CSV table of C-alpha atoms in Angstrom, one decimal:
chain,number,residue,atom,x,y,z
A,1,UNK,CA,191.7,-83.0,29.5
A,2,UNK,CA,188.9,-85.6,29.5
A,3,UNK,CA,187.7,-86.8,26.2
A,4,UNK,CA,185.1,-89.1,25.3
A,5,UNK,CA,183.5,-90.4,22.3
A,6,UNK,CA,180.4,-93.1,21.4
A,7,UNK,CA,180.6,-95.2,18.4
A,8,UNK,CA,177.6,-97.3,17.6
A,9,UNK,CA,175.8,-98.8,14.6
A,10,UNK,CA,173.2,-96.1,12.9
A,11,UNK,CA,170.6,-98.7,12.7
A,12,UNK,CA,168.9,-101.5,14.7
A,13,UNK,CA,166.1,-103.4,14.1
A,14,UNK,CA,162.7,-103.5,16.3
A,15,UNK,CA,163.2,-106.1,19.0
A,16,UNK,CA,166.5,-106.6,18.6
A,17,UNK,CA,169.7,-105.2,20.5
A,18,UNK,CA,171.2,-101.7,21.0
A,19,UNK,CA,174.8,-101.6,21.8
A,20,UNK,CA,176.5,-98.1,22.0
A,21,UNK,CA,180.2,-98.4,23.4
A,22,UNK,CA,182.1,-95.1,24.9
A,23,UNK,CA,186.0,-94.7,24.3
A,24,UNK,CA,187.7,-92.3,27.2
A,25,UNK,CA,191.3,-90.3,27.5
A,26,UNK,CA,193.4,-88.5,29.1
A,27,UNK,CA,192.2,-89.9,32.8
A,28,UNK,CA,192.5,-92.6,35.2
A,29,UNK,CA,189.6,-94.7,33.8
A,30,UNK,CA,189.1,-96.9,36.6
A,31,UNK,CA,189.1,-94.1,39.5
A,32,UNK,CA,185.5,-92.5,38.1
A,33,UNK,CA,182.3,-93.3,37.3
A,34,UNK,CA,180.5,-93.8,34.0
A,35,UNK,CA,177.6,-92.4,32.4
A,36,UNK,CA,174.9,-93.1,29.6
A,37,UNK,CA,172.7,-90.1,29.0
A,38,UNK,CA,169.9,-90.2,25.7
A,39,UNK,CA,167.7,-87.5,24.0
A,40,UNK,CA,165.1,-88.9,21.6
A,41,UNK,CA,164.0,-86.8,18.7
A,42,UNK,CA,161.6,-84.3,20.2
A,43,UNK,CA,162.1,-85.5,24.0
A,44,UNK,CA,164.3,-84.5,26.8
A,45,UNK,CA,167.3,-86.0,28.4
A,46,UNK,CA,167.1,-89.3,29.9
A,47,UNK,CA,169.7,-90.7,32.4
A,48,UNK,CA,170.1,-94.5,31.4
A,49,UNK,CA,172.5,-96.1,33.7
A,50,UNK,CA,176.1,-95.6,35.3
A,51,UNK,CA,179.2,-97.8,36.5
A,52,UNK,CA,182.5,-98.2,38.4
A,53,UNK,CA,185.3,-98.1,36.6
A,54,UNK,CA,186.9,-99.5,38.9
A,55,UNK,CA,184.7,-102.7,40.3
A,56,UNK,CA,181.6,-102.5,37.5
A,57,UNK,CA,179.4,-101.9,39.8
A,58,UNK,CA,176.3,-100.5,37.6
A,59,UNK,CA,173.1,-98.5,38.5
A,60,UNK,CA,170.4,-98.2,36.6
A,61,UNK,CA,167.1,-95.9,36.0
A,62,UNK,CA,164.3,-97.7,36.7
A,63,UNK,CA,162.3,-97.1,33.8
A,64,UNK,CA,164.9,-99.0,31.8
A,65,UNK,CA,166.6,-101.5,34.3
A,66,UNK,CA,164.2,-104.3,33.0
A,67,UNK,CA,166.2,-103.9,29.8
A,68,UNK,CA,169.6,-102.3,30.2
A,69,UNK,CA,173.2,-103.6,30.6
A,70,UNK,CA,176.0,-101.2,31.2
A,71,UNK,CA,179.7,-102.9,31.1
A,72,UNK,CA,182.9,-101.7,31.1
A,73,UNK,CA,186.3,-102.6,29.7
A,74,UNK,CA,189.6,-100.7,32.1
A,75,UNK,CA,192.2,-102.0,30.1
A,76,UNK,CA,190.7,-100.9,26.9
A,77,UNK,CA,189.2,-97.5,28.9
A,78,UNK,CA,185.8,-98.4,27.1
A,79,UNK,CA,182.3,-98.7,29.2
A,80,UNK,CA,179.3,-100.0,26.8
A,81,UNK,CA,175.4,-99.8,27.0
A,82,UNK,CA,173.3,-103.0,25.4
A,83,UNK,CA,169.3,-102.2,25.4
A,84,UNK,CA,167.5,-105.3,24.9
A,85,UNK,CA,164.0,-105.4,22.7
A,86,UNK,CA,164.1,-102.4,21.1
A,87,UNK,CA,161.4,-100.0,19.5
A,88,UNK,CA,160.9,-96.7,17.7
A,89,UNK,CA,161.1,-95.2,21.6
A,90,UNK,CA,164.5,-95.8,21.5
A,91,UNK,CA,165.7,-93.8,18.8
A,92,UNK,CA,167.7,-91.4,20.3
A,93,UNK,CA,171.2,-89.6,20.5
A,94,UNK,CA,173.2,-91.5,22.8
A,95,UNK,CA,175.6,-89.7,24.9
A,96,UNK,CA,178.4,-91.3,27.3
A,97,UNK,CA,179.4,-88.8,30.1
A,98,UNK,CA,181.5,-88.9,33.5
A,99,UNK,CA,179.4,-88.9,36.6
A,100,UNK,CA,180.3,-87.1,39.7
A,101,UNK,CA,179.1,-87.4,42.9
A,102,UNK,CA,179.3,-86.5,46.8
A,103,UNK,CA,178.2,-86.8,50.4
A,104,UNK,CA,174.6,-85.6,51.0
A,105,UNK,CA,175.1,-84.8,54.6
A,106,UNK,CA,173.2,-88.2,55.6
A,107,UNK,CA,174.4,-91.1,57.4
A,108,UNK,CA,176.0,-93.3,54.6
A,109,UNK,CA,174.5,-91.5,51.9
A,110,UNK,CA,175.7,-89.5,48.5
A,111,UNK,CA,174.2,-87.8,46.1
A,112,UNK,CA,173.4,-89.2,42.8
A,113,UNK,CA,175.1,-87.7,39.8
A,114,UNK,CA,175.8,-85.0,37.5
A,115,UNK,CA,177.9,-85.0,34.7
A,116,UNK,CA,180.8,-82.9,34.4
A,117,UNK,CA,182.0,-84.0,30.5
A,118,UNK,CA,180.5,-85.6,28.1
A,119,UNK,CA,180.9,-86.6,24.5
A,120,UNK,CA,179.7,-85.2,21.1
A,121,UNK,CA,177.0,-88.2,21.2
A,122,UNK,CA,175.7,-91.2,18.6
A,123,UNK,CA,172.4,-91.0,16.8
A,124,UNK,CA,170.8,-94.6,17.0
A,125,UNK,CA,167.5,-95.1,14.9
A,126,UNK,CA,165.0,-98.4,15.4
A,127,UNK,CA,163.5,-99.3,12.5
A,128,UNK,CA,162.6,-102.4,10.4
A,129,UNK,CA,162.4,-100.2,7.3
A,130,UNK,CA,164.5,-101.9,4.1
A,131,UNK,CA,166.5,-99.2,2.2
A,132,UNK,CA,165.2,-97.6,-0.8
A,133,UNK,CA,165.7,-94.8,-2.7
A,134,UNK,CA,164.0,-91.7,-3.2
A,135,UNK,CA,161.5,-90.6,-6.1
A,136,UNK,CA,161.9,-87.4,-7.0
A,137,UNK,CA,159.2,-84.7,-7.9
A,138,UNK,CA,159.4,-81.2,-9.0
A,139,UNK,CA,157.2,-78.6,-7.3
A,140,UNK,CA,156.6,-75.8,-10.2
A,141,UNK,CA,155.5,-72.1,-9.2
A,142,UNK,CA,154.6,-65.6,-10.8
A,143,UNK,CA,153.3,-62.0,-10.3
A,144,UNK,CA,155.8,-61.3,-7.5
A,145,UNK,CA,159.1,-60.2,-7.9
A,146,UNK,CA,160.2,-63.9,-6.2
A,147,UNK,CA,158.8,-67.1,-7.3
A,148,UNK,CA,159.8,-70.2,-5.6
A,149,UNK,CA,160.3,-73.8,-6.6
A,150,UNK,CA,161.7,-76.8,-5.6
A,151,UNK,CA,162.0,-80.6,-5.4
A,152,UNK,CA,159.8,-83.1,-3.6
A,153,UNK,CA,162.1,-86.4,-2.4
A,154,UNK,CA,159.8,-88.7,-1.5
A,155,UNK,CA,159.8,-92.3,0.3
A,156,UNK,CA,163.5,-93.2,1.2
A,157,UNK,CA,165.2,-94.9,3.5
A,158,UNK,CA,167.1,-94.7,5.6
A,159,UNK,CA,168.6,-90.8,6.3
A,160,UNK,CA,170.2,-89.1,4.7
A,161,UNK,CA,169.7,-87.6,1.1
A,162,UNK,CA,171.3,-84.6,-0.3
A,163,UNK,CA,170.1,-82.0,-2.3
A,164,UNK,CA,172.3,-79.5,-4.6
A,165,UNK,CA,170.4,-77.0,-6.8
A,166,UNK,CA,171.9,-77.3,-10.7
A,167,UNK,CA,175.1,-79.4,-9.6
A,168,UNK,CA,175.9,-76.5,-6.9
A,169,UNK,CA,176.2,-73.5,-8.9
A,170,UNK,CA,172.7,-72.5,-7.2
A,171,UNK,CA,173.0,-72.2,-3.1
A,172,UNK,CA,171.4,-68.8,-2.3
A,173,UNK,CA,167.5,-68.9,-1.1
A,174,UNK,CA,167.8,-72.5,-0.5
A,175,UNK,CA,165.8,-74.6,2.1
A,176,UNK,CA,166.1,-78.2,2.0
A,177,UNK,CA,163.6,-79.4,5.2
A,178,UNK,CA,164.1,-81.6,7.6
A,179,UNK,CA,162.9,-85.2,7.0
A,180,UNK,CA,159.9,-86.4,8.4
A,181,UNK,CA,159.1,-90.1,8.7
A,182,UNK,CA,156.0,-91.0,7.4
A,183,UNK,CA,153.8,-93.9,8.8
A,184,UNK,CA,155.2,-96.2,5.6
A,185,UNK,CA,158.6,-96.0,7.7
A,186,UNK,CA,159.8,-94.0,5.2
A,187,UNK,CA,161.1,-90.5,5.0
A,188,UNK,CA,159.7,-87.7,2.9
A,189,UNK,CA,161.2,-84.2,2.6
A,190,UNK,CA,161.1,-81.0,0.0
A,191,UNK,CA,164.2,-78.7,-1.1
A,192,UNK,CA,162.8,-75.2,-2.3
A,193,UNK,CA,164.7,-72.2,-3.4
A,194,UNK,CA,163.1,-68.6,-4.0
A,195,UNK,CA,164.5,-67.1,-7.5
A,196,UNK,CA,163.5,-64.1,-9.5
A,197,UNK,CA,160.3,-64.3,-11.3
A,198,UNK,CA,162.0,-62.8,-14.7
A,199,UNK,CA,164.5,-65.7,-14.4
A,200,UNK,CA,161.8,-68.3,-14.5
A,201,UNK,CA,161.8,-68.6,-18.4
A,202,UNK,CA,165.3,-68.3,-19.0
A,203,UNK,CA,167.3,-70.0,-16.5
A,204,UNK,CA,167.5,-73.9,-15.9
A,205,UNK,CA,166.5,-75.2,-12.5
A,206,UNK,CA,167.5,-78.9,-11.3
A,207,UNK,CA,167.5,-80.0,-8.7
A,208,UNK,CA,170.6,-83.5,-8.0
A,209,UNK,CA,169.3,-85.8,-5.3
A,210,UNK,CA,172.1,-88.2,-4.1
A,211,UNK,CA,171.4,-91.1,-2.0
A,212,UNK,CA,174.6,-92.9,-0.6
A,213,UNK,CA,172.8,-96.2,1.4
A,214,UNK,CA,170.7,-97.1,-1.7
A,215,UNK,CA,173.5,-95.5,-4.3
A,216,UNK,CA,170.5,-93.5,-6.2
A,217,UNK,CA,171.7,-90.2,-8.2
A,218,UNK,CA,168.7,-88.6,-9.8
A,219,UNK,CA,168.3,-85.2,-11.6
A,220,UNK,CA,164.9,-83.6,-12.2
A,221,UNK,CA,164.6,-80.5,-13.8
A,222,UNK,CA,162.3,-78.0,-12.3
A,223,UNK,CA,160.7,-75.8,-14.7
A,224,UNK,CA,156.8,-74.1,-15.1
A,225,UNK,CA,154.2,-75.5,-16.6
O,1,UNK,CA,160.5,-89.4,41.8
O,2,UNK,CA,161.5,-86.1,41.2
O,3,UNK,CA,160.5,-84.1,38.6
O,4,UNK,CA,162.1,-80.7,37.7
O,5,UNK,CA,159.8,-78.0,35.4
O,6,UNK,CA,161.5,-75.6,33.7
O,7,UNK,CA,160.4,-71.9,32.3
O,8,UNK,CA,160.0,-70.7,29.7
O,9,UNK,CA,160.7,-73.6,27.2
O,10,UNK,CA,161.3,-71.7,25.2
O,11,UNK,CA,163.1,-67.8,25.1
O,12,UNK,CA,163.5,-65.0,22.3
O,13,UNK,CA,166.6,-62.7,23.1
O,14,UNK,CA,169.1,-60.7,21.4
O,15,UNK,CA,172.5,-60.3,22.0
O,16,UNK,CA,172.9,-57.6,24.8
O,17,UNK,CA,169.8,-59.0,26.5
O,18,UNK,CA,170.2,-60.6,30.4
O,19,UNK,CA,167.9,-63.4,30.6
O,20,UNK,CA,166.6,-65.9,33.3
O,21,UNK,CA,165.6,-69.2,33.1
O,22,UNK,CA,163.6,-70.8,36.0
O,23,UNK,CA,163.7,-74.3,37.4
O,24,UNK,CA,161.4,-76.2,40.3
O,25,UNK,CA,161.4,-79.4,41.8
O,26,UNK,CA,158.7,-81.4,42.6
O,27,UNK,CA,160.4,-81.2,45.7
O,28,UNK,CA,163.4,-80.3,47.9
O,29,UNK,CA,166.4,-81.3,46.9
O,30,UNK,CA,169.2,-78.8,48.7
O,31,UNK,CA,171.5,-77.3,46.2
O,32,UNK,CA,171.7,-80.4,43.9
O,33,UNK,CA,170.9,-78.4,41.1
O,34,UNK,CA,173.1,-78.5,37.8
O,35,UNK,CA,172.6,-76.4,34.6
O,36,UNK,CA,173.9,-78.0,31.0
O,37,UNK,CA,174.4,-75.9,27.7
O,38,UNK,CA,173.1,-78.0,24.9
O,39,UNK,CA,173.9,-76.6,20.6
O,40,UNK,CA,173.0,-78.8,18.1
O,41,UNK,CA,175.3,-81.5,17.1
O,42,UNK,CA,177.9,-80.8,19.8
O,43,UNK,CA,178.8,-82.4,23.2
O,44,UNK,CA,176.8,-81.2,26.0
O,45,UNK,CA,178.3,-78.8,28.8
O,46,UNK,CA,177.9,-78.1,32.5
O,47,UNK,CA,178.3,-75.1,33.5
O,48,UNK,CA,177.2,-74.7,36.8
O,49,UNK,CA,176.9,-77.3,39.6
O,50,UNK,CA,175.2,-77.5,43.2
O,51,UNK,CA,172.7,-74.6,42.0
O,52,UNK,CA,175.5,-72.0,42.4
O,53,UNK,CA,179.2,-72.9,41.4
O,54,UNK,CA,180.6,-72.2,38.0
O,55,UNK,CA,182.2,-74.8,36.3
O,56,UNK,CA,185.9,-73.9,35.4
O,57,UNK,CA,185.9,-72.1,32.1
O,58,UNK,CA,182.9,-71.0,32.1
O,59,UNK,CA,182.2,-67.7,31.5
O,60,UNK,CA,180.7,-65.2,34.7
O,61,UNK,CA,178.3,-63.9,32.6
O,62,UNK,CA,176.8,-67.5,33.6
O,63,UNK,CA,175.1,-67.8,37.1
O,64,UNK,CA,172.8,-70.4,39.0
O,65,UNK,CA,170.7,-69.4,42.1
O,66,UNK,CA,168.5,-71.0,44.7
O,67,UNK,CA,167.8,-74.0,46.7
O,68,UNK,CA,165.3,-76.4,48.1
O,69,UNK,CA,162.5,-76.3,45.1
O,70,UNK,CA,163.1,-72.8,43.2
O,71,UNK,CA,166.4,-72.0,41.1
O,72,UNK,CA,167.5,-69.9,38.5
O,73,UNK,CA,170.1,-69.8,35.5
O,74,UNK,CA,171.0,-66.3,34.6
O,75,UNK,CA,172.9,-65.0,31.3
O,76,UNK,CA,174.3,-61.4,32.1
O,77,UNK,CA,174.4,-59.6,28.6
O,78,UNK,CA,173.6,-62.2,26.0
O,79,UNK,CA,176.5,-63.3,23.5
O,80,UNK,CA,175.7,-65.1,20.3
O,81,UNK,CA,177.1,-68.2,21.3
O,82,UNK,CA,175.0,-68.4,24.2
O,83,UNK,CA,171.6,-68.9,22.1
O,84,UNK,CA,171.6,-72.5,22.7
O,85,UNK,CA,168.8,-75.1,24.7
O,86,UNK,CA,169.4,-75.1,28.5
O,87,UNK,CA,168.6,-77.9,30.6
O,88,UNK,CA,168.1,-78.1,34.8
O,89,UNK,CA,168.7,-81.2,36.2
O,90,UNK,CA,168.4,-82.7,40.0
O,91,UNK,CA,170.7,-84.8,41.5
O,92,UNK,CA,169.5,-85.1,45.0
O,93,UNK,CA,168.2,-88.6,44.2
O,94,UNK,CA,168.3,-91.3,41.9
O,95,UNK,CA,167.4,-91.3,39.0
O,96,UNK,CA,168.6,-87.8,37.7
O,97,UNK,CA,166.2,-85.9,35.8
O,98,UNK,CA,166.5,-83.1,33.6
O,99,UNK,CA,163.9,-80.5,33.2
O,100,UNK,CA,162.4,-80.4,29.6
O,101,UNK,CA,164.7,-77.7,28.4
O,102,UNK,CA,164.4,-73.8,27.1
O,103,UNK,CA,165.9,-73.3,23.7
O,104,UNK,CA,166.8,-69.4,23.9
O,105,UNK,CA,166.4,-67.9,19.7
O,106,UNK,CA,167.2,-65.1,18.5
O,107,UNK,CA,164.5,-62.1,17.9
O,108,UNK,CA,164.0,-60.2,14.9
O,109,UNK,CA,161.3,-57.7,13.7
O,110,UNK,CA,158.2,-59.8,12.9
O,111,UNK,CA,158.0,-60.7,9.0
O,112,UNK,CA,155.4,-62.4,7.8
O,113,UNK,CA,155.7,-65.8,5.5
O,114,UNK,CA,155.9,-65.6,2.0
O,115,UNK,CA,152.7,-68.2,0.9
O,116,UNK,CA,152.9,-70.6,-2.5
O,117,UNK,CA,151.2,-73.8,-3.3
O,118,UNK,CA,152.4,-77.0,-5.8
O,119,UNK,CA,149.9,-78.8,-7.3
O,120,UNK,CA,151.6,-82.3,-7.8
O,121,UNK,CA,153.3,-82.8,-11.1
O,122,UNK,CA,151.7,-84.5,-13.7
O,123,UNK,CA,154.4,-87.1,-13.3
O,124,UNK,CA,153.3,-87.7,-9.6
O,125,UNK,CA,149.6,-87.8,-10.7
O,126,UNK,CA,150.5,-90.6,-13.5
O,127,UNK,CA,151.7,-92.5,-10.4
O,128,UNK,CA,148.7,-92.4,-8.8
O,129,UNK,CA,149.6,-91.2,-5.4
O,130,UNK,CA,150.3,-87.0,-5.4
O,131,UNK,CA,151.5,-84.4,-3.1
O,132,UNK,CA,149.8,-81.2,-2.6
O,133,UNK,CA,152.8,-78.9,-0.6
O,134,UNK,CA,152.0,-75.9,0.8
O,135,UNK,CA,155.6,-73.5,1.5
O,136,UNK,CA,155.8,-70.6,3.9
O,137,UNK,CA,158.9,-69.0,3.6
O,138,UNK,CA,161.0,-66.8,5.4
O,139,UNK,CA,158.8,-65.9,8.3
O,140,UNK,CA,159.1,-64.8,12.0
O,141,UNK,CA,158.2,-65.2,14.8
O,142,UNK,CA,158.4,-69.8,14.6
O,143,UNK,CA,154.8,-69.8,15.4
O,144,UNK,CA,152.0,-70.0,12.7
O,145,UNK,CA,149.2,-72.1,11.7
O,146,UNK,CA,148.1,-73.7,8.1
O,147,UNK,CA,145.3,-75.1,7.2
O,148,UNK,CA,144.6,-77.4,4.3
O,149,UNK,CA,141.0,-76.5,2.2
O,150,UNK,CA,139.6,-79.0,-0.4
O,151,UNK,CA,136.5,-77.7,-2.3
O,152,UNK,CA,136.0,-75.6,0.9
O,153,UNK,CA,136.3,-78.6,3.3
O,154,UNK,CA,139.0,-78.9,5.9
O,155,UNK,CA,141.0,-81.7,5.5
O,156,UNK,CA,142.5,-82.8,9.0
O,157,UNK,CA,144.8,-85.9,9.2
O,158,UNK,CA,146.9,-86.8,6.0
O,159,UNK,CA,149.4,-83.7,6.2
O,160,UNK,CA,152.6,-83.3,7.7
O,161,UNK,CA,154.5,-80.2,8.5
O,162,UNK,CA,158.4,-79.6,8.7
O,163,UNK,CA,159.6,-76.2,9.9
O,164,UNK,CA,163.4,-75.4,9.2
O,165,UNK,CA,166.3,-74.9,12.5
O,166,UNK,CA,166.3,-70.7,13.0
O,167,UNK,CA,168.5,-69.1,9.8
O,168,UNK,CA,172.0,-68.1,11.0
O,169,UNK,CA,171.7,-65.3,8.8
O,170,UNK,CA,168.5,-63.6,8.8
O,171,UNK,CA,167.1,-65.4,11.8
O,172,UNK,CA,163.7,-66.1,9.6
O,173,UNK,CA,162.0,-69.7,9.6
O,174,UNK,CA,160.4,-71.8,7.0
O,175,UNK,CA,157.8,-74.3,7.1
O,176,UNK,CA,156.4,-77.0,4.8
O,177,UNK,CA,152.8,-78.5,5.1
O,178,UNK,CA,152.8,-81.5,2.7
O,179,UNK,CA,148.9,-83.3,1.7
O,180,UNK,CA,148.7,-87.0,0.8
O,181,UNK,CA,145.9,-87.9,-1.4
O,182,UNK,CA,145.7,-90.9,-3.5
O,183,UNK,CA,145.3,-89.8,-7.3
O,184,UNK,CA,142.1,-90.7,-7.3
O,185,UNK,CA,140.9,-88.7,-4.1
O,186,UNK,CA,143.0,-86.0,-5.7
O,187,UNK,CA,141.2,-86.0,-9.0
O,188,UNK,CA,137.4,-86.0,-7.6
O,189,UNK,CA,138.0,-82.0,-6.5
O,190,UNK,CA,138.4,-79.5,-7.8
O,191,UNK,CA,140.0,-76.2,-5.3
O,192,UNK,CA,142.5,-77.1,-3.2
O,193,UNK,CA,143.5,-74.1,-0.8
O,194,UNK,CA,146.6,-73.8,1.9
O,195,UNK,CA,145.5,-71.2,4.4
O,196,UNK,CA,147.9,-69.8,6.5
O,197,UNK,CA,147.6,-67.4,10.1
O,198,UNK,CA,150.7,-65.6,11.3
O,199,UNK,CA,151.5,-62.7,13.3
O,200,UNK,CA,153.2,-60.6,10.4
O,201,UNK,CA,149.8,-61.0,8.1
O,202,UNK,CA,146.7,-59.1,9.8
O,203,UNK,CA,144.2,-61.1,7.3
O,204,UNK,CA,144.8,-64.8,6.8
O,205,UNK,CA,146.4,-65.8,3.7
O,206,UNK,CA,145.0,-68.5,0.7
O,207,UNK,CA,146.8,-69.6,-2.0
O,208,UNK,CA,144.7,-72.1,-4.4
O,209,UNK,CA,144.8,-73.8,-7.7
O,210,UNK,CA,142.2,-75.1,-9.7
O,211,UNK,CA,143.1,-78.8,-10.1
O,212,UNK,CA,144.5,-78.5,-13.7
O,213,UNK,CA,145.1,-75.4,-14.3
């Protein structure tokens, strides 16, 4: 019935501002109330702020009104989020949601909300990094029956890379790890893949790092030493 | 103002299972209670609202209790699309607030991690800043320990560890414990040993090299 969906840009820079706008269907925009929810990396759910659809009337959490504008567009059936000055605290998935409410039983008073839909969410990251490509290293092993190996993609920015193991043909036993940004601003991550020993002086392992933003293709060949 | 706590954060179950998840408030707030169902990469869900009603839709096998500072979410007989992160949240006063979450996982029979160490290429030690990456593969349960040895010494700071979302498969994890050393750091030792703790290994495990070997 109700759909929703954010659009944003990926990336902002420290300082600057965050704008995240919400498209809504198959509803009466103006007749409920609007919703910005966030989860950073690693951190729980945040409510950010909330408004009319009807007169734009906003609220706001505290901890961010210092910062925070929530608008809304009826004819277009659009509300937006703009979050002033920025930082690294901000990176977060930013979802847009519909916000229900009732009577508490007090004189003049409701609740406040929860959210009954909301929409698939926009990752936004803060960071000043500039893009760059990855290097690529091999990481070479073999008593077992299983050896592993793999590929160290160092220093890129910004997310993602893929990895493919000898242009595909290789899938099973794969692990290709989350990134993790290192205090350059820049991410670092390893693919590894567990083979059989025996295979290890036959067969030819390499590993194809692609990275769209910075259009790098590299191919390293993994192999013992 | 009001803070909600959840428990456990985190849950291992199997399919079959009926589980409860816990939720208190720092303090009353009636039966303003509502419970979301959070997977990765996919819009959130309600699925229950004012601490008791089901959200159309949703499943009975789904079921809130309590009011004033205690609640509960129960799962009757566990499916595998319900292992997912579950999140309380008040809404008795403003601001909402969401408690900090329980991501249920799915048990297995312990196994412990399959151990190797890569010395940096010789590539990497030509550029003069090298990698030492210590691999644990294919382990369960998440939780386990590594500690990075240089000539004996315990090197603390420098390392960072990435640990891989559950295996939809085999339900195993795997974890990565990278060392940054400048070359020249790296080249004034000599053993350099990943140590690694875990449930499934009743003796601790080291893998070494001998710096150019």
């Amino acid at each position: 019935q109700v759909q929703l969906q954010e659009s944003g840009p990926g990336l902002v820079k420290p300082s600057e501002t965050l704008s995240v706008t919400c498209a809504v269907s198959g509803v009466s925009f103006s007749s409920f109330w609007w919703g910005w929810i966030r989860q950073p990396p690693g951190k729980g759910l945040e409510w950010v702020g909330t408004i009319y659809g009807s007169s734009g009337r906003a609220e706001y959490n505290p901890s961010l009104k210092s910062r925070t504008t929530v608008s809304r567009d009826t004819s277009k059936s659009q509300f937006s989020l703009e979050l002033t000055s920025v930082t690294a605290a901000d990176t977060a998935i930013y979802y847009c949601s519909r916000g229900l409410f009732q009577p508490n039983g007090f004189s003049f008073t409701l609740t406040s909300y929860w959210f009954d839909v909301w929409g698939p969410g926009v990752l936004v990251t803060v960071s000043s990094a500039s893009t760059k490509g990855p290097s690529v290293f091999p990481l070479a092993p073999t008593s077992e029956s299983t050896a592993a190996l793999g590929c160290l993609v160092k220093d890129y920015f910004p997310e993602p890379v893929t990895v493919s193991w000898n242009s595909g043909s290789l899938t099973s036993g794969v692990h290709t790890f989350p990134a993790v940004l290192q205090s350059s601003g820049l991410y670092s991550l390893s693919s590894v893949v567990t083979v059989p020993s025996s295979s290890l002086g036959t067969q030819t392992y390499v590993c194809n790092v692609n990275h769209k933003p910075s259009n790098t293709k590299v191919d390293k060949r993994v192999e013992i030493k | 103002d009001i803070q909600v706590t959840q428990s456990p954060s985190s849950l291992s179950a199997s399919v079959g299972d009926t589980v409860t998840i816990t939720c208190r408030a720092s303090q009353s707030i009636s039966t303003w209670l509502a419970w979301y169902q959070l997977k990765p990469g996919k819009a959130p869900k309600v699925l229950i609202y004012k601490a008791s009603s089901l959200e159309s839709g949703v499943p009975s096998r789904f079921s809130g209790s309590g009011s004033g500072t205690d609640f509960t979410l129960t799962i009757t007989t566990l499916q595998s699309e319900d292992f997912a992160t579950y999140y309380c949240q008040q809404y008795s006063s403003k601001p909402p607030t969401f408690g900090q979450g329980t991501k249920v996982e799915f048990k297995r029979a312990v196994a412990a991690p399959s151990v190797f160490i890569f010395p940096p290429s010789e590539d990497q030690v030509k550029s003069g800043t090298v990698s030492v990456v210590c691999l644990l593969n294919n382990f369960y349960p998440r939780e386990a320990s590594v500690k990075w040895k240089v000539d004996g010494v315990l090197k603390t700071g420098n390392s960072q560890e990435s640990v891989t979302e559950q295996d939809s498969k085999d339900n195993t994890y795997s974890l990565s414990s990278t060392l940054t050393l400048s070359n020249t750091d790296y080249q004034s030792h000599n053993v350099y040993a990943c140590e690694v703790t875990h449930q499934g290994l009743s003796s601790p495990v080291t893998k070494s090299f001998n710096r150019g070997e």
